[PDB]
């Protein structure tokens, strides 16, 4: 009656994990932290096929593309930092005084003028040099100063030519694998997606390294989206995706120099040196009204999970490192750490601009590795910066004695959640082209 | 090449069986260089494993191959209409994955092996 | 192995068609180790792409394969003598490369696909 028939090319897939190569246009330059050793050129025709009558189970919280991106970004940081100047002769005693230049009261003590002995191109001669160092980079040797990492880690200067500006990268699957995109606009990243397509590569994802705020990310199409591995678990971060972005205006007003010091036979140390004009605090402005309407939308969407009559409180971070207690980020080449206590300070009952002070740092341990730190060279001129706040990473306060109110604070640190906000709609699947089915046909 | 790839994934199995070449053409194309090379090599040997499976049956160089293995109603008792006009290949795979290895074993146990031996012998008379 | 490789490149197409195996045998065999491995892997997947193209037509395991695609005089209006006794394969490729993709599309569009489906159906009666 019926016989086994073998079909090859059958459209069937399974869940699997694989290594995804990265496509990138990579135009310009004639010096990129990422697309120079790992990724490859883009695709002129990005082809997306809508899989009709297809409902597919997605899970952004068990997506191996996020882990692959984490490993790739860390490795690419390390590779970019490998061929640069090692700053081991700068772990010496530093004689430091306060800056005599005109300094605002807020910036008093933040910057130190430090004189020290350094190596020259000739190993038998020493030079007396001086440099400006931020107070967050400088530890007193006793109750004479020293850099912060000298006790724990060796320091490597970042190559000034290499730029820290994120460029989009598309994650593409090899042959025999596919990337399924969830096209549902209300999708919270877990469960069945009815509107599915297949793509060669993901969209252009800028590897933006930041805490407490998702800058230059994608925007929700319809409404603010609240996503969490377990919304009832306070230990799990809450990813908030905006539908309209909030513009953020960051700047370091100091007109800065970059003094070159020949530390070795061909090695250069780029210190700050001097500031032309007045000295003022670096800061970030956001619109008060825009932030108000965005927080109102976030509260409206949080009340879906936490009840309609509950009071939603926004408070600043409870504690941690400077990376997680502040909106830490990097644009213009310098590393900002901005106090978001003015962003999150509200109580929403169920019924102009904000200026965030920012502190700059030059010694950074980005991924908390042991025995490795980076010196960020100073940038010549005045650095300004404009970005779209497109989301938040929040943490709900646990152990609440009062059941009527819920408190949410900024969070971050683990950047796997920064790119979970981008890779939530993608899923790697594995084509099983061989099928067997009954047909009336019989081999002779 | 990529056009129509998996487009009939939600089609019926009968309708998706007319698009097998779009899904068959798409199975063949520093540390990251090693990663890309490992991906390419894995794809190649996977494709070759599938082609070897097709070839140890009578299905070499064929995307549809009729066999001499009878269908057992212990694997699926649906009539052809439910399979080829009401169901999709993903649902069919979910239903039949528990017996797939038995079916493969039967495909290479007796039919192709005894067929080949019998054609060895029929080329004598 | 390498003997006679491309020796009939300047021969007529008819005469060069008797030497296809010398050019078919020759398609299969630190940072520089990665370079050699990339070359070998590329050769392998290229050979497999060509074999897949042959197999999605009826031309699997064949160096000469007759098809059911008619010749269109919009691709070349020469008579067999000009092609197989006066021209070489390089000149023919230069002449016919603009239509090659149309010919490949026709080879896998209807003839092998409808043939296979019709043999699926002829194995019922």
């Amino acid at each position: 009656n019926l016989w086994v028939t073998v079909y090859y090319g059958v459209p069937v897939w399974k869940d699997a994990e694989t290594t995804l190569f990265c496509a990138s246009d990579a135009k310009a330059y004639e010096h990129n932290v990422w697309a120079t050793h790992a990724c490859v050129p883009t695709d002129p025709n990005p082809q997306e096929i809508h899989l009709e009558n297809v409902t597919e189970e997605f899970n952004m919280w068990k997506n191996n593309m996020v882990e692959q991106m984490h490993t790739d970004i860390i490795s690419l940081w390390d590779q970019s930092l490998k061929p640069c100047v090692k700053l081991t002769p700068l772990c010496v005693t530093l004689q430091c005084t306060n800056v005599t230049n005109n300094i605002t009261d807020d910036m008093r003590g933040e910057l130190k003028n430090c004189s020290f002995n350094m190596t020259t191109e000739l190993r038998d001669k020493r030079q007396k040099v001086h440099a400006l160092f931020y107070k967050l980079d400088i530890v007193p040797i006793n109750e004479s100063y020293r850099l912060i990492n000298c006790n724990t880690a060796a320091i490597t200067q970042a190559c000034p030519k290499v730029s820290f500006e994120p460029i989009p990268i598309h994650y593409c699957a090899p042959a025999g694998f596919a990337i399924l995109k969830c096209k549902d606009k209300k999708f919270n990243g877990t469960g069945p997606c009815p509107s599915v397509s297949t793509v060669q590569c993901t969209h252009g994802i800028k590897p933006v390294v930041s805490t407490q705020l998702l800058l230059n990310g994608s925007l929700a199409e319809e409404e603010v989206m609240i996503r969490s591995k377990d919304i009832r678990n306070n230990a799990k971060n809450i990813l908030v995706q905006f539908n309209t972005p909030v513009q953020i205006n960051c700047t370091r007003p100091n007109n800065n120099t970059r003094k070159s010091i020949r530390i070795g036979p061909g090695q250069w140390f780029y210190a700050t040196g001097d500031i032309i004009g007045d000295i003022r605090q670096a800061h970030c402005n956001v619109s008060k009204a825009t932030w108000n309407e965005t927080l109102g939308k976030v509260v409206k969407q949080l009340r879906k999970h936490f009840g309609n009559n509950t009071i939603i409180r926004f408070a600043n971070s409870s504690g941690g490192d400077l990376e997680v207690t502040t909106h830490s980020f990097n644009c213009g080449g310098e590393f900002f750490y901005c106090d978001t206590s003015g962003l999150f300070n509200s109580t929403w009952i169920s019924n102009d601009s904000i200026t965030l002070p920012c502190r700059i740092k030059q010694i950074i341990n980005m991924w908390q590795r042991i025995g490795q730190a980076m010196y960020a060279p100073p940038i010549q001129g005045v650095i300004r910066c404009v970005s779209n706040i497109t989301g938040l990473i929040l943490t709900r306060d646990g152990g609440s004695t009062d059941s009527t109110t819920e408190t949410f604070r900024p969070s971050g640190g683990d950047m796997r959640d920064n790119w979970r906000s981008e890779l939530y709609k993608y899923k790697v699947v594995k084509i099983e082209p061989l099928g067997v089915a009954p047909t009336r046909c019989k081999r002779r | 090449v990529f056009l129509g790839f998996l487009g009939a994934a939600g089609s019926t199995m009968g309708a998706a069986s007319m698009t097998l070449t779009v899904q068959a053409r798409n199975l063949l194309s520093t540390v990251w260089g090693i990663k890309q090379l490992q991906a390419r090599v894995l794809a190649v040997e996977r494709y070759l494993r599938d082609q070897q499976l097709l070839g140890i049956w009578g299905c070499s160089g064929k995307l549809i191959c009729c066999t001499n293995v009878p269908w057992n109603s212990s694997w699926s008792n649906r009539n052809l209409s439910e399979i080829w006009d009401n169901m999709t290949w993903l649902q069919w795979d979910k239903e039949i994955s528990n017996y797939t290895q038995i079916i493969y074993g039967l495909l290479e146990e007796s039919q192709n092996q005894q067929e080949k031996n019998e054609q060895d012998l029929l080329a004598l008379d | 192995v390498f003997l006679g490789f491309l020796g009939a490149a300047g021969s007529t197409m008819g005469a060069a068609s008797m030497t296809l195996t010398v050019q078919a045998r020759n398609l299969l065999s630190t940072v520089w180790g990665i370079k050699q491995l990339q070359a070998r892997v590329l050769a392998v997947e290229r050979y497999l792409r060509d074999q897949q193209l042959l197999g999605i037509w009826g031309c699997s395991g064949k160096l000469i394969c007759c098809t059911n695609v008619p010749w269109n005089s919009s691709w070349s209006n020469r008579n067999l003598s000009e092609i197989w006794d006066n021209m070489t394969w390089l000149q023919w490729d230069k002449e016919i490369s603009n239509y090659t993709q149309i010919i490949y599309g026709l080879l896998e569009e209807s003839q092998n696909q409808q043939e296979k489906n019709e043999q699926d159906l002829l194995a019922l009666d």
Partner: nanobody
Amino acid sequence: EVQLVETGGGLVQPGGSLKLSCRASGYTFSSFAMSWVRQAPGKGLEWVSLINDRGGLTFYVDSVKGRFTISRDNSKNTLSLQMHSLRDGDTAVYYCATGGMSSALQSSKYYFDFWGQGALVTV
């Protein structure tokens, strides 16, 4: 609801030619194999020809193998039977019917389910 109407039956001289046509409605034409079956006036039914659902496979009885040609157009829902070198034995009422075979992905339909009216051919 199924309807199969034959047009083209008439008078033709011996050795002539004739194209019968059958227009179908009320069902999916492209999902059915078609057949031509003739009955001479005083005699019984005789199977003439058969064509599959896609129109690629054509089968004939040996008496008309080189002379008759069955074809179909699924876009137009038409079934054609071209007849050449007509002999005296081809005088009959020709019926177009649905069935005769089926695809491998369908149950066996070795029977003629829905018949047409008829078209009288006289030689």
